[PDB]
Design a protein around this ligand. Structure first.
Ligand code: AGS
Ligand code: AGS
Ligand code: MG
Ligand code: MG
Lengths: 396, 87, 396, 98
DNA sequence: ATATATATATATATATATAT
DNA sequence: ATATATATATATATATATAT
C-alpha cells in the first residue's frame, strides 16, 4: 500500500575526496605530528562522514586529553585542514575523537536516509528521518515521543526542506488510518503542495481565521480523545489502539461509551510567526493547551518559526516544547533563543541542524536531508492515486 | 542644497562655488550662492545637559553625530566619564 | 546592452611595491629574530598585498604556535613595523602567518576587481564585488545567497563607497529585466545620483515620508510574487524562472494565473538605517521586519547601512534574519561585537577595510574594499540614462 | 524508595519530611517513582487511615489510579479547579488545626 | 512605552597549581 | 624558583524578558 521508495531520487555519484588511502596517509600524518608534540597516540579507526571525519584515537596510558586538546590550533596547520576539533568523550569506548572537516560538503539526498535498518524496523506511526549524523549514521527520531518539535532558523537555512523531510517520513510509512495531518502554512508556498492527500483532515490552511478554527477543533478532538480513553481505562493512545485491536480481532467489536482505531495527528505549522502576527491572541491559549497536554491523546505539533522569541512564542508555549532543532542562526543570542547553548551559530547553513533530544542538553548534530520540489510532487501524486481527500468539513 | 548641486560634501561645495565665481557669476539657489561655514557645536559638560534636559536633547545629539559630517556640522562633547549612563 | 567595464578609471600603476630584495631581507631578519627567541622557523614564501604582506613562515617539528603568538610584539619591535598580528592557522597549508602592515598602503581600484575573470563569469543576476582580499585575490560574493546584508561602521570608515561598489557590481551585470533596485537615503545626498537609471522602479526616496510608501510597495510586490508562485507549485524565484524558461523554450509560454515573463531580483538598498528609524519610527520597522521574515523566496534582497547596528536601531527580529554582516572599522570593541559577534573589526585601518563575515563562519574574510570615485558613478549613471528609459511604477 | 548504593533499601516515612519535591527531566523515572511511592502508601495503609488527592495538569497520567477507596476527589486534570481543590486543602488544614 | 532583573562577553586584578 | 594555565571576584556594556 505504501508507495515504493523508488519514487525518491537515488543516491548521487560524488567525487569522494577522502579515498581510503588518503585517510590512511592522514591518520599516519596525525600520529606523527602528535608524537612530535610529546603525546604518543595510535589511531585505530576512522569515520568519514558527509561533512566531517572523526579520527578515533587511542592515546597511550598517561596521556591526558587536555594535552591533546590544547594542540587543536597546531594539528590544524599540521594536517593542512581548516580547524581540528577534539572530542573528549566517545561514549562506551576508550578513544578520543578528532573531527577533521572535509574539503567538500557532500549533499545528503533523502533516498539515502530511508534505506537504513533503523527506519524500516522502526515501529511507530510517526517517524522522522532528520538526516545523517556526523558519523554518517542515519538519525531516525520518533515524533510520538519527543513529543513536540520547535524548528527554527534564519532565512535560507533549510527549515521547510527539513519539514518536507519530516512529512515525507510520515507519508512513506503510515496510511491515513494511522496518521492524519493538519497543515497551517500562512506563507502559502511550502505546504500548499500537499493538496488533497488522503492524510489531510482539513485543507492546507492559509486563512488565519480558518487556522484558529483548525486549532480550536484540534483542542476539541484532543479532549474528545481524552474522554474516549478515560471511559475505557487505557493510559494513552497506544494502549487504546492495542486494546481496540485486540477486542475487534477477538470477536468483540466494542462500541463507544462500533469503535475504530484512532490515528495520530501531526499539526504542522510553517512560519508560526505570521500566524501569531495575524490571529495570535486567539491562538496563544489553544497552542499553550495543545503543547501542554496533547501527548497521550496523540496530537503533535511542528512549530517551524524563524526566531523563538517571547513576542512570537510566549514562554509558556516554548517551555512545554523541549525538543528543538536549530538551523544556522546568524548571531549567538538566537542560538540562546532556540537552544539554550551556543553551537547553532557555527553551522554550515544548508541542511545542517543541532537536533536537541528531549532528556539531555547535548545537541546531537545532524546533517539535514534534501527533498526537492519534484521529488515531493511525485510522492504526493502517487499517494493521491491511492485515496481520496476525505476532509473533515466542520474543522473550519 | 548640496544634493541640488550634485556635490557630496561641504569641501566639494566650496570648491564648486569658488570655481563658479572664478568663471563669473555664482550658482543660483533652488538668490546668489556663496561659501558655507563649518558649524562647530561645543557642548561642554555633556553629563548634566542630559540630566537637566534628558530625553529631549539626546536624539538630537545622536542625529548630529550620525549624519552631520558631510554637512560641516562638527561636535566637541566635553564630559567627565562618558559611560552609557551619560552617553 | 550592458555598459563596458572600461567606463571606470583604468588600473592604478603600482605604488613603490616592495622589490624582492627588501622582502627577502625582512624574511631573513624574521628568521634570525625568531631564532634569537628559541623558535626554529623557515620562511617559505612571501605574499605581498595592498595593505599587509603575509610572511608565510613554517615552524620546525614540535613548535607550538603560541610561542609565536606571544612574540607577536617583539617581531614588530625587531622589525621597523608598527605592529604584527600572527595567523595561527592558514586554511590549506602547513605554514603559519606573519602579517606586516605596508608602509606605503596603496589603494584598490574597482576595475581591477571587475575585469578579473571571477566577475566576468559569475553566473548570478546580482553579484557583489567587495574588493581584493589580503593576498590580492578578488572577493566576489553573490547576494541571492546571503540573502540579506548589514553594512556597518563608523563615520569615516567607507560604508558609502562600499554601497556604491555594490551597486556598480549590480549594474555591470544585470539589465533592467534582471535586477530592479529600491534605493532609500535619509542623507538625501548619497544615493541621489543614481536617479534616472532604468533599474529603479521608484524615485530615490529622499523625503522621509515616502520611505513608508516605498516599503509598503515592497511588501505588496512581495505578496504578489508570493501568490504568483503559489499558483504554480514553485517554492522560490529560481524555480519560477526555470519554469517560465522551460515553457518559452518549449514553444508554449505559460499564462498568468496575459503572459508570464522572468521576474527581476529586487534589491532594497536602505542607506543610513539609523537616521531612518530616528525620523520615521515604528512606521517602517514593521515593513523592514516583514521583508526580513520573507522576500527571500520572492527574490527581494535587503542591503542595509548603519552605524553600530543595535536594538537601539535594528530590532532583534530584523537583525536575526540578516545572515551576512560586512563591518568596516568601528570605534570600540563592544561596538564590533554588535555587528560581527566577535571583536575583530577594531584593528581595521579604515579607508575601506572590512571584515566580510559569511553566514556562519567564525573567521571573517578580511577584504580591503574597493574605491569608486564619484566620476565613475556619474559616468555609469549617464551611460544608463541612455541605454534605457527611466522607469517608475507609478502606483507606488 | 529503591535501594542505596550499598544494596540495602531506603524506606522513609513521608510524615517526617513532611513535604517532598520530585524533579528531573524527561525519561528519568519520575512517573515510576510516583507510582512506587503510591504503592508504598497502598500496601501499608487502609483507606480508613490515609487518603489522596491527585492533580496532574498532564491528563490521564495519574488516571491509572481511579476507583481507589481513598481518593478524596477524582483525578483533578484541568487548570481552573486545581487552585480550588488546593483552597479546599487549605480549609481542611485550618479546620484540622481548630 | 518605559524602567528593572538576568545572563554574557570582556577586561582587569588575585591566588593556586602545573611546566622548564 | 620562575614563567604560564585555570579558576574567581568586580566592573562595564548589551540583549532579552519581565513588570508598572
Ligand atoms: N540538505 C540540503 N542540501 C542542500 N541544500 C539544502 C539542503 N536543505 C536545504 N537546502 C537549501 O536550503 C534552501 C531551502 O530552505 P528553505 O526552507 O526554503 O529556507 P527557509 O527555512 O524556509 O527560510 P524561510 O524563513 O522560510 S524564507 C534551498 O536553497 C536549498 O537548496
Ligand atoms: N575603498 C577605498 N579605498 C580608498 N579610499 C577609500 C575607500 N573608501 C573610502 N575611501 C576614502 O575614505 C573617505 C571616507 O569614505 P566615505 O565613503 O565618505 O565614508 P562614509 O561611508 O561616507 O561614512 P559616513 O558615515 O557616510 S560620514 C572617502 O572620501 C575616500 O577618500
Ligand atoms: Mg520556510
Ligand atoms: Mg557614507
Amino acid at each position: 500500500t505504501l508507495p515504493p521508495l523508488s519514487l525518491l531520487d537515488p543516491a548521487e555519484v560524488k567525487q569522494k575526496s577522502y579515498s581510503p588511502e588518503s585517510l590512511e596517509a592522514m591518520s599516519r600524518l596525525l600520529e606523527i605530528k602528535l608524537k612530535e608534540f610529546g603525546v604518543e597516540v595510535s589511531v585505530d579507526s576512522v569515520h568519514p562522514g558527509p561533512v566531517i571525519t572523526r579520527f578515533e584515537i587511542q592515546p597511550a596510558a598517561g596521556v591526558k586529553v587536555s594535552r591533546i586538546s590544547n594542540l587543536a590550533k597546531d594539528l590544524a596547520r599540521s594536517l593542512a585542514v581548516i580547524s581540528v576539533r577534539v572530542v573528549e568523550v566517545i561514549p562506551g569506548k576508550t578513544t578520543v575523537g578528532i573531527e577533521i572537516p572535509n574539503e567538500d560538503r557532500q549533499m545528503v539526498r533523502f533516498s539515502e536516509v530511508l534505506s537504513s535498518p533503523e527506519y524500516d524496523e522502526h515501529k511507530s506511526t510517526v517517524p522522522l528521518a532528520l538526516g545523517h549524523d556526523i558519523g554518517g549514521r542515519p538519525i531516525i527520531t520518533d515524533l510520538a515521543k519527543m513529543p513536540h518539535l520547535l524548528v527554527a532558523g534564519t532565512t535560507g537555512s533549510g527549515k521547510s526542506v527539513g519539514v518536507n523531510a519530516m512529512l515525507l517520513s510520515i507519508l512513506f510509512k503510515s496510511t491515513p488510518s494511522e496518521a492524519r495531518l493538519i497543515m497551517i502554512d500562512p506563507k502559502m508556498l511550502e505546504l500548499s503542495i500537499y493538496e488533497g492527500i488522503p492524510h489531510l483532515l482539513c485543507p492546507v490552511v492559509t486563512d488565519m481565521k480558518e487556522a484558529a478554527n483548525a486549532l480550536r477543533w484540534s483542542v476539541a478532538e484532543m479532549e474528545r480523545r481524552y474522554r474516549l480513553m478515560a471511559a475505557m481505562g487505557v493510559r494513552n493512545l497506544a494502549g487504546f489502539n492495542r486494546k481496540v485491536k485486540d477486542a475487534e480481532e477477538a470477536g468483540t467489536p466494542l462500541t463507544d461509551p462500533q469503535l475504530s482505531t484512532l490515528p495520530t495527528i501531526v499539526v504542522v505549522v510553517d512560519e508560526f510567526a505570521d500566524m501569531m502576527m495575524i490571529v495570535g491572541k486567539k491562538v496563544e491559549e489553544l497552542i499553550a493547551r495543545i503543547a501542554q497536554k496533547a501527548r497521550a491523546a496523540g496530537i503533535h505539533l511542528i512549530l517551524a518559526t524563524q526566531r523563538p522569541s517571547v513576542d512570537v512564542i510566549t514562554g509558556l508555549i516554548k517551555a512545554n516544547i523541549p525538543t528543538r532543532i536549530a538551523f544556522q542562526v546568524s548571531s549567538k543570542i538566537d542560538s540562546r533563543t532556540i537552544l539554550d547553548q551556543g553551537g547553532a551559530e557555527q553551522l554550515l547553513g544548508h541542511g545542517d541542524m543541532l537536533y536537541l533530544p528531549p532528556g539531555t542538553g547535548l545537541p546531537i548534530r545532524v546533517h539535514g536531508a534534501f527533498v526537492s520540489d519534484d521529488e515531493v510532487h511525485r510522492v504526493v501524486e502517487a499517494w493521491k492515486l491511492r485515496g481520496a481527500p476525505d476532509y473533515i468539513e466542520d474543522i473550519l | 542644497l548640496m544634493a541640488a548641486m550634485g556635490v557630496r560634501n561641504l569641501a566639494g561645495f566650496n570648491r564648486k562655488v569658488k570655481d563658479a565665481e572664478e568663471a563669473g557669476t555664482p550658482l543660483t539657489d533652488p538668490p546668489q550662492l556663496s561659501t558655507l561655514p563649518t558649524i562647530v557645536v561645543v557642548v561642554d559638560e555633556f553629563a548634566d545637559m542630559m540630566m537637566i534636559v534628558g530625553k529631549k536633547v539626546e536624539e538630537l545629539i545622536a542625529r548630529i553625530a550620525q549624519k552631520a559630517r558631510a554637512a560641516g556640522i562638527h561636535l566637541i562633547l566635553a564630559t567627565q566619564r562618558p559611560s552609557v549612563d551619560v552617553i
